[PDB]
Amino acid sequence: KTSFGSLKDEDRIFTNLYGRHDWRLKGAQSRGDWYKTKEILLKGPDWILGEVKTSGLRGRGGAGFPTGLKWSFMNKPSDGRPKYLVVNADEGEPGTCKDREIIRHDPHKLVEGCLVGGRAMGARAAYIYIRGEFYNEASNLQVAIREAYEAGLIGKNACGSGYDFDVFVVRGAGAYICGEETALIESIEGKQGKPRLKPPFPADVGVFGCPTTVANVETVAVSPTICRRGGAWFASFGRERNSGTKLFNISGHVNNPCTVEEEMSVPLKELIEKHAGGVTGGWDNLLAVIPGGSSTPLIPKSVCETVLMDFDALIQAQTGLGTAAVIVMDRSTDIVKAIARLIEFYKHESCGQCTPCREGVDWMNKVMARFVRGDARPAEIDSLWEISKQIEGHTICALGDGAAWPVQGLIRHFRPELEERMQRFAQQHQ
Amino acid sequence: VNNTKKWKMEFDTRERWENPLMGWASTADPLSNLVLTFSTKEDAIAFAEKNGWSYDVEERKVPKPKSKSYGANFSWNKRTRVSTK
Amino acid sequence: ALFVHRDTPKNNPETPFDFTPENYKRIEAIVKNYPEGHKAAAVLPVLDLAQRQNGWLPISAMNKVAEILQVPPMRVYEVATFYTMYNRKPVGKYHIQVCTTTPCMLRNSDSILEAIQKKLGIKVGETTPDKLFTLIEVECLGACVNAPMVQINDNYYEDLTPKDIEEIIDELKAGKIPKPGPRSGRFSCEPAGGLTSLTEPPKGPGFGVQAGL
Ligand SMILES: NC(=O)C1=CN([C@@H]2O[C@H](COP(=O)(O)OP(=O)(O)OC[C@H]3O[C@@H](n4cnc5c(N)ncnc54)[C@H](O)[C@@H]3O)[C@@H](O)[C@H]2O)C=CC1
Ligand SMILES: Cc1cc2nc3c(=O)[nH]c(=O)nc-3n(C[C@H](O)[C@H](O)[C@H](O)COP(=O)(O)O)c2cc1C
Numbered sequence A: 001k002t003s004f005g006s007l008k009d010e011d012r013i014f015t016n017l018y019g020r021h022d023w024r025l026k027g028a029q030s031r032g033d034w035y036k037t038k039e040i041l042l043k044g045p046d047w048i049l050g051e052v053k054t055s056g057l058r059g060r061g062g063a064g065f066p067t068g069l070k071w072s073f074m075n076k077p078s079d080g081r082p083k084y085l086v087v088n089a090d091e092g093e094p095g096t097c098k099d100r101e102i103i104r105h106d107p108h109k110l111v112e113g114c115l116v117g118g119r120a121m122g123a124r125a126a127y128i129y130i131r132g133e134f135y136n137e138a139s140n141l142q143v144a145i146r147e148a149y150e151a152g153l154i155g156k157n158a159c160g161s162g163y164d165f166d167v168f169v170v171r172g173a174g175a176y177i178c179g180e181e182t183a184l185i186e187s188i189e190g191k192q193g194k195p196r197l198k199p200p201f202p203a204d205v206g207v208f209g210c211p212t213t214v215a216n217v218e219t220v221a222v223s224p225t226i227c228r229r230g231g232a233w234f235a236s237f238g239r240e241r242n243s244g245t246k247l248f249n250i251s252g253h254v255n256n257p258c259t260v261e262e263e264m265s266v267p268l269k270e271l272i273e274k275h276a277g278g279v280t281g282g283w284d285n286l287l288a289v290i291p292g293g294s295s296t297p298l299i300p301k302s303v304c305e306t307v308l309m310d311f312d313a314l315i316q317a318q319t320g321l322g323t324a325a326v327i328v329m330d331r332s333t334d335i336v337k338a339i340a341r342l343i344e345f346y347k348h349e350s351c352g353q354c355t356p357c358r359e360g361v362d363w364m365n366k367v368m369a370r371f372v373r374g375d376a377r378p379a380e381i382d383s384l385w386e387i388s389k390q391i392e393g394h395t396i397c398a399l400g401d402g403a404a405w406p407v408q409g410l411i412r413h414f415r416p417e418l419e420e421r422m423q424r425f426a427q428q429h430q
Numbered sequence B: 001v002n003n004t005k006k007w008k009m010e011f012d013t014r015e016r017w018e019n020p021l022m023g024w025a026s027t028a029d030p031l032s033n034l035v036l037t038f039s040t041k042e043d044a045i046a047f048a049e050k051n052g053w054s055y056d057v058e059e060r061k062v063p064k065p066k067s068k069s070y071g072a073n074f075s076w077n078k079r080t081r082v083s084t085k
Numbered sequence C: 001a002l003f004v005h006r007d008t009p010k011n012n013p014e015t016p017f018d019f020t021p022e023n024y025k026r027i028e029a030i031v032k033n034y035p036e037g038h039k040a041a042a043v044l045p046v047l048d049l050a051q052r053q054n055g056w057l058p059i060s061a062m063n064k065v066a067e068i069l070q071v072p073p074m075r076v077y078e079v080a081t082f083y084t085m086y087n088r089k090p091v092g093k094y095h096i097q098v099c100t101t102t103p104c105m106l107r108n109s110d111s112i113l114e115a116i117q118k119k120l121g122i123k124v125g126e127t128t129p130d131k132l133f134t135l136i137e138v139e140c141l142g143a144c145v146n147a148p149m150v151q152i153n154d155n156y157y158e159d160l161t162p163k164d165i166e167e168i169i170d171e172l173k174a175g176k177i178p179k180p181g182p183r184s185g186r187f188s189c190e191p192a193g194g195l196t197s198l199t200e201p202p203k204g205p206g207f208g209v210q211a212g213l
């Protein structure tokens, strides 16, 4: 296949994305969830891991690590410590609101994914770390978890398979850095959400010092559908090493901002024009698109014409796929002000642990705050570039990368607008 | 640790008293500033024996090799968990 | 905006705070979610439980959470100052949180911030003098396609206009409770000009399940 997109409703994993059907167990079982879960759990961890590896599922958090290879790190004999699945439900990324819809409208799909993934990795329980601002979503998920315990689907003798598996929900308390996996693990343990240094990866030392897999809501919730429908089914979508469906959150300067499920390597222009109603003022009014939420570098309208919304094509477009959150910015946008608000976000959401993020994200925000007004000189642009290169790769977690990348994308695609901003400041203030 | 790489020879500190005019540190010891540098212990011993100085030698104290592990900060059941980080 | 504490007569370690007994049963339910030997893992919910009983956290709720969980009080002070939900000052009864990051700023959340300011007569960070409304300005609340949105104490109010948020503030001042959703025509997150997806009925149990299963 060469052209991607135009996904059919029979090939959706997240039916009831919009709340138009019943989210409870009577609705979820009538849509295909909790069907033959016992026969999945009895075929062993190796079969489930082989279905996830065969499907080519990559991590829907945004790094795109291979999900089967990641989950197979737990497939090892125990040493007295329990093992845990931990479902990353924080979703603090600006642009991204898909996991909110998964938890809120397909909760039993997430709970069944917790059971299937925890059987795949030998996990004792599931800790779903939901964002604390998602209070109604957390109570929604707890009602679905109570319905799953009252039906014997999880807990003691889960789905009649002889496997014991709990599902816990831990609420956050307002930190974007608690979506990073080791900082999330610290946040469950009753601490400041400060990321750990890797190694140890959480498959060695995770939550409470146990073996732990932290995985996104989407990459957990699609796993029972991958186990039922098959690995080849999910791998038949998108490009190669770009397998499956993906939730997209098209927000910003589009006519109809929405969450929509779509095949993996769909064109960005086709996605915005088809599911979002197109850019406000037309496609000629498009100035920039942040492809995958705030941490990905923006790409301008010349790149957005032919770009495909999977991992490798956006890597070739010197950005990332990320959370697949499409932030559309038209020609009426002060783009320096938008990227500087984004760097302001990244210094309010930064845990202050290591030196390059704690100091340089504040220093980038001060330089960007002067770039908004133009109160600078052009030699400070490349300087700011170097500051970003002193943060990228020198930090503990990737929030330094996620704060250095928008600065780099803005400089790389809009250096002339920065320079004309600063020179008009100079000619009207001296 | 770059000041702990060589052997030094010094002498016993003698009397320093207060200058009656200015309060400066008056001394009468000529050897009060004589610090010598030696590559090994035996060069220092040989230099002191050659000069007729009664000497005493303190052996080099190295720090013993510690056992470090970043993962030990987050043990499942040991007391070595950090309460914060 | 201070991350040190000074003992005021309304915030000191002798400020009266204790849990209700039903809050103690909820605390026991929270503590039994975590393994034995890791009771400190219940610091974040229980302290938030102390924020739900009281509305804010004096330094008697932090010390009570430190006492009932056998953790040092500094390790609770760290969690209370690290996380942005824990009110270390008494906020009003309705805590309005206006998201002003880039996907909400593009869809004109500044107009709603100004509308709440001129409707409540206060500005960002301040409290209305009847102690009913606290207006602050928060980061991305994760409702980006429903921009521009606010949060009132648990509830997301989404797809807002100035008239919509004035209506919400009016029926908060009237004692009622508004409906937590989008204030435009749509329901949760669909394309507003009709469904571009999921128009077919869902297929049900057994559809596409592979052989050998
Ligand atoms: N989903 C969301 O809401 C958000 C997602 N992100 C995305 O998160 C990404 C950065 O997150 P990270 O997990 O810190 O980066 P990534 O480099 O490390 O790793 C992704 C996953 O692979 C695992 N992994 C990677 N290499 C491994 C190895 N050699 N051995 C064992 N496990 C290994 C990690 O443990 C992790 O679970 C970015 O791509 C960013 O776009 C960022 C912010 C919000
Ligand atoms: C600063 C930062 C914040 C993150 N926030 C989230 C998040 O909110 N939700 C999420 O699922 N992943 C988040 N991630 C990615 C996680 O580190 C982790 O890779 C992911 O949750 C699970 O891996 P997976 O994508 O392979 O499933 C964040 C990463 C960083 C660096």
Ligand code: SF4
Pocket: A177, A194, A195, A349, A350, A351, A352, A353, A354, A355, A356, A357, A358, A395, A396, A397, A398, A399, A400
């Ligand atoms: S780079 Fe920033 S987000 Fe990461 S450990 Fe350091 S302070 Fe924390």
Ligand code: FES
Pocket: A093, A094, A095, A096, C099, C100, C101, C102, C103, C104, C139, C140, C141, C142, C143, C144, C147, C149
């Ligand atoms: S940007 Fe305001 S909710 Fe995400």
